[PDB]
Each structure stands twice: as C-alpha cells, then as structure tokens.
Amino acid sequence: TINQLVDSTSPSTIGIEEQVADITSTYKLLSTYESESNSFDEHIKDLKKNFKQSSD
Amino acid sequence: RDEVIKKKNQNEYYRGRTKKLTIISTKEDFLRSQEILAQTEKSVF
Numbered sequence: 001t002i003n004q005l006v007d008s009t010s011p012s013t014i015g016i017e018e019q020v021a022d023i024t025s026t027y028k029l030l031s032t033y034e035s036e037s038n039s040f041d042e043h044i045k046d047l048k049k050n051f052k053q054s055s056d
Numbered sequence: 057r058d059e060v061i062k063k064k065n066q067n068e069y070y071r072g073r074t075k076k077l078t079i080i081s082t083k084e085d086f087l088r089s090q091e092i093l094a095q096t097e098k099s100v101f
Contacts, residue, residue: 007060 001023009016066072 004057004060008063
C-alpha cells in the first residue's frame with residue numbers, strides 16, 4: 001500500500017497527510033493487536049506452567 | 057496496485073497529449089503565401 005501510494009499519488013496534489021496518518025494509526029492499532037496476542041500467548045504459557053506446578 | 061499500474065499507463069498518455077500534437081503548417085503556410093505574394097492582380101484583370 002505504501003509503494004502504490006507513492007506510485008499513484010500526484011506529487012502536485014497535496015492531501016495525503018490524512019491518508020498516511022489514518023493508516024499510521026491503523027497500523028499502530030494492528031501492531032497493538034499483534035502485541036496483545038503475543039502477550040496473551042506469553043501469559044498463556046506462564047499461566048500453564050504455574051497452573052501445572054500448582055496442580056501437581 | 058492495479059490502479060497504480062493503470063494510472064502509470066495514463067501518465068504515458070504522455071504520448072497521449074504529446075505524441076498526438078500545430079505550427080508546422082503555420083510556419084510553412086506563411087512561406088507559401090509570402091512566396092506566392094510576389095507571384096501575384098484583379099486591377100490588371
């Protein structure tokens with residue numbers, strides 16, 4: 001999307017700052033979701049280890 | 057991306073307004089009339 005955004009956008013036309021900012025927020029949100037899932041998996045691993053130790 | 061390729065092709069309507077295009081006749085037509093002005097009279101007729 002970045003490459004094609006450079007490819008298409010007319011350098012004489014301004015108004016891409018809002019597009020880039022919105023996709024910036026979107027990608028930060030998506031990276032946040034990925035990080036949430038990563039920490040969720042890490043918490044799952046630690047929780048599983050602790051639960052197994054306590055149950056045993 | 058597909059529309060990117062299409063719009064790059066539309067920039068290659070560079071030939072689209074460049075290759076298709078005024079004064080070649082204009083420069084020469086002057087020479088045609090200027091040469092023919094000395095050639096030519098209704099008063100004589």
